[PDB]
Design an enzyme around this catalytic site. Structure first.
Site, short mmCIF file in Angstrom:
data_model
loop_
_atom_site.label_atom_id
_atom_site.label_comp_id
_atom_site.label_asym_id
_atom_site.label_seq_id
_atom_site.Cartn_x
_atom_site.Cartn_y
_atom_site.Cartn_z
N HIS A 114 -6.69 -6.62 -5.13
CA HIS A 114 -5.64 -7.28 -5.87
C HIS A 114 -4.71 -8.09 -5.26
O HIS A 114 -3.75 -8.65 -6.15
CB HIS A 114 -5.24 -5.94 -6.77
CG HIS A 114 -3.95 -5.39 -6.12
ND1 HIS A 114 -4.07 -4.48 -5.35
CD2 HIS A 114 -2.57 -5.61 -6.87
CE1 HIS A 114 -2.73 -3.98 -5.03
NE2 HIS A 114 -1.94 -4.91 -5.81
N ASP A 115 -4.22 -7.98 -4.07
CA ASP A 115 -3.14 -8.55 -3.40
C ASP A 115 -3.74 -9.24 -2.30
O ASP A 115 -2.83 -9.75 -1.32
CB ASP A 115 -2.16 -7.62 -2.99
CG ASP A 115 -1.05 -7.40 -4.11
OD1 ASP A 115 -0.92 -8.36 -5.00
OD2 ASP A 115 -0.37 -6.22 -4.32
N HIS A 117 3.58 -6.37 0.73
CA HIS A 117 1.94 -6.76 0.45
C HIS A 117 0.96 -6.98 1.39
O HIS A 117 0.61 -8.26 1.71
CB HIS A 117 2.15 -8.09 -0.49
CG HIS A 117 2.89 -7.63 -1.71
ND1 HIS A 117 3.91 -8.27 -2.19
CD2 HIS A 117 2.47 -7.10 -2.94
CE1 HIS A 117 4.48 -8.06 -3.47
NE2 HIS A 117 3.40 -7.23 -3.88
N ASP A 155 -0.61 -0.02 -9.18
CA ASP A 155 0.03 -0.90 -8.42
C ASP A 155 1.58 -0.70 -8.75
O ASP A 155 2.48 -0.87 -7.62
CB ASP A 155 -0.01 -2.48 -9.29
CG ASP A 155 0.50 -3.51 -8.31
OD1 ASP A 155 0.46 -3.51 -7.02
OD2 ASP A 155 0.88 -4.45 -8.91
N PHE A 183 15.02 -0.94 -11.58
CA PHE A 183 13.50 -0.78 -11.52
C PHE A 183 12.80 0.44 -12.42
O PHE A 183 12.16 0.22 -13.15
CB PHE A 183 13.02 -0.77 -9.90
CG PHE A 183 11.66 -0.58 -9.97
CD1 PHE A 183 10.66 -1.62 -10.31
CD2 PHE A 183 11.00 0.34 -8.96
CE1 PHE A 183 9.42 -1.33 -10.31
CE2 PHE A 183 9.76 0.60 -8.80
CZ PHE A 183 8.76 -0.20 -9.35
MG LIG Z 1 0.16 -8.41 -6.74
ZN LIG Z 2 0.21 -5.10 -5.78
#
Ligand SMILES: [Mg+2]
Ligand SMILES: [Zn+2]
Ligand SMILES: [Mg+2]
Ligand SMILES: [Zn+2]
Lengths: 291, 291
Positions: free
Chosen positions: A122-123, A82, A227, A256
Site C-alpha cells: 500500500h505505500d 512511510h 493504516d 488527529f
Molecule cells: Mg499511503
Molecule cells: Zn500507509
C-alpha cells in the site's frame, strides 16, 4: 529459505516475538531489529504461515521470499514513517482486524489474501509526505510498483492462481490500496456508517455480508483502519510512530485523534461490537494529554 | 484597546495565565482558549509589554492590535499545526530563549524586536505541509505576507523607526525567517557548532558577540530552535503539538528527537551552558517511549 524468509543471527528471539503475530500489541519495532531490519518480509511470512496461505494458494516459499525482499527493498529506508516498517505494521493490523470474532467465516481466502497483499504494498516507493491528475495518483503508483515487482524472476507469488482469481484479487487490491488515500476518508466513513446502520448478524453473532458490494466496502474500511491504527496501539508504540511521523513531516476544529481517528474507529467499533472496545479504550488513554 | 489587544470574557483568567509568559512551560493552549482563540495577538502584547517594547519604539497600542489581528487572521485556522497558535508558541519560546542568562545584554532592542516579529510572522499563510524555485520559496512567501500587512491602514507598527532601523530590522527578519526553512537546518547547525567551539565569555559568564556576523548566526539559530522547541516542552504540551502535526500530516537512521531535535538542542545547550540543561532533561524524558 529461512523460517521467516529473512536471514538473522537472533532467529531464536525473532520467533518468540512473532508469537504475538495475532496480537494487537505486537512490538513490530522489536521485530524490525530481530529480523535484520526486514520487518515486512518477516511479518508477511509469519502471517501467511499462520493462515496457511502458502499451501492454500500453492505459493512457493522461495518465490514469496524473493518477492518480499524485493518489495521491502522498494520502500525508502530514509523516509521516516512511510517505509517497510509501516507496511509491516499495517499488514499485521489488517491480519488481526480480519480475525475479529464478528467477521468469522465472512471472507474467502482470496479476499483475505488480497487484503494482506494490499496492506503489504500500500505505500511502496513512497517518497515522503513533503516530497509527494488528482485521482489517487500516489496510491495508483503504489499499486503499479507492487504489481510490477511480481513480474521479476521467481517473484510471481500468484502463479498458481487461476485467471479468474487473479482478476478478482487484482480488482480487490486496487480497491483497498486506493482506499488508503486520505482524500477518500470522508466518503469511506459515510459508507461504513451505512454498513453499520443496515448491519445484519446471524444467531452466532457474526456479520452477514452475503453481497460482494457490501464485502468490498468493509474490506476497504478495514485496511483504511489498519493504516490509521497507530492511535489504538499501546502508548509506547504510538509514541514511536508519532516520532517517525514528525521526522517525515520536517524532512526538508483541529486534532488527529479527535477529528480523524475517533470518528473512524468509533464507527468500526459499532460494526463489530464488542470486539473493538479495547481499541477505543486505548485511543481514549492516548487522548489524555495529562495522563 | 484591550489589555492584550484581544476581546474576551475571561480576561481575568487570561491575565493570570499570561503571568507565565516568561516561563518555558507556558500553557499556550490555555491562552488560546482564554483569548477567544487569538493566542498570537495576546502573546505578542504580553511579550512586548514585558519588554517595554511599545514605549521603546513608540509603537501605538491600537496599531499593534490592528496589525496583529490582521496577521493572526492570515494564518489558516483549518491548518492543524501551522496556524497562529504555532506562531504564538514560537514567539513566546523566542522570548524566553532571548532572556537566557548567558545572553544577557548581548542583543540590542532592535535585534530583539526583529527576532520576535520574525517569530510572529514566520509561518503566516502556510497552506499545510501536504499543500506546500528551490530557494526557500515558502519562507519568502511568509515574509512577503508579514511585510505586506504592515501597509494596511493603521498597521505599520514600525512607523516610528528610522529608515536606518527599518533597513536593519527588515534584513534581520528576513534572515531569521529564512532560517526556519528545514532545508537550511544542516548548514545552520554547522554554523552553530562553530559558534560554540569559538565561544568567548566575559568574567560575568555572558557570551561575547561583539561582531554582528556572529550575532545574526546566533539569532538565526535561536529562532530555528524556537521553531523546533516542541520536544523540549513538558510532555502534556508536546503530545498536543504532536497530535496537531499528525492531523496536518494526514490532511488530504530515523527519528525526530534522535536525528533532528537532539543534535540541535545539544549544540544550543553547549552555547549557553548551564542555562538549557533543563530543556535537554525534558527532551530526554520525552524520548523515553516506555516512561
Ligand atoms: Mg499511503
Ligand atoms: Zn500507509
Ligand atoms: Mg515554517
Ligand atoms: Zn514554524
Amino acid at each position: 529459505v529461512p523460517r521467516f524468509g529473512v536471514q538473522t543471527d537472533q532467529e531464536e528471539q525473532l520467533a518468540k516475538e512473532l508469537e504475538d503475530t495475532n496480537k494487537w500489541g505486537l512490538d513490530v519495532f522489536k521485530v524490525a531489529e530481530l529480523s535484520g531490519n526486514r520487518p515486512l518480509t518477516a511479518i508477511i511470512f509469519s502471517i501467511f504461515q499462520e493462515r496457511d496461505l502458502l499451501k492454500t494458494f500453492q505459493i512457493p516459499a522461495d518465490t514469496l521470499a524473493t518477492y518480499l525482499l524485493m518489495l521491502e527493498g522498494h520502500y525508502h529506508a530514509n523516509v521516516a514513517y512511510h517505509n517497510s516498517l509501516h507496511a509491516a505494521d499495517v499488514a499485521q493490523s489488517t491480519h488481526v482486524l480480519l480475525a475479529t470474532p464478528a467477521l468469522e467465516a465472512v471472507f474467502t481466502d482470496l479476499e483475505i489474501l488480497a487484503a494482506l497483499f494490499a496492506s503489504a504494498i500500500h505505500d511502496v516507493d513512497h517518497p515522503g509526505v513533503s516530497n509527494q491528475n488528482d485521482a489517487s495518483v500516489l496510491e495508483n503508483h503504489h499499486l503499479a510498483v507492487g504489481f510490477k515487482l511480481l513480474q521479476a524472476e521467481n517473484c510471481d507469488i500468484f502463479q498458481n492462481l487461476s485467471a479468474k482469481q487473479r482478476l478478482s484479487l487484482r480488482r480487490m487490491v486496487i480497491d483497498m490500496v486506493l482506499a488508503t488515500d486520505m482524500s477518500k476518508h470522508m466518503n469511506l466513513l459515510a459508507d461504513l456508517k451505512t454498513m453499520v446502520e443496515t448491519k445484519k448478524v446471524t444467531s452466532l453473532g457474526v456479520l452477514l455480508l452475503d453481497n460482494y458490494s457490501d464485502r468490498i466496502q468493509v474490506l476497504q474500511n478495514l485496511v483504511h483502519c489498519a493504516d490509521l491504527s497507530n492511535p489504538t496501539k499501546p502508548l509506547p508504540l504510538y509514541r514511536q510512530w508519532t516520532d517517525r511521523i514528525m521526522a517525515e513531516f520536517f524532512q526538508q476544529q483541529v486534532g488527529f485523534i479527535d477529528y480523524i481517528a475517533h470518528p473512524l474507529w468509533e464507527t468500526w467499533a459499532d460494526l463489530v461490537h464488542p470486539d473493538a472496545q479495547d481499541l477505543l479504550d486505548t485511543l481514549e488513554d492516548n487522548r489524555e494529554w495529562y495522563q
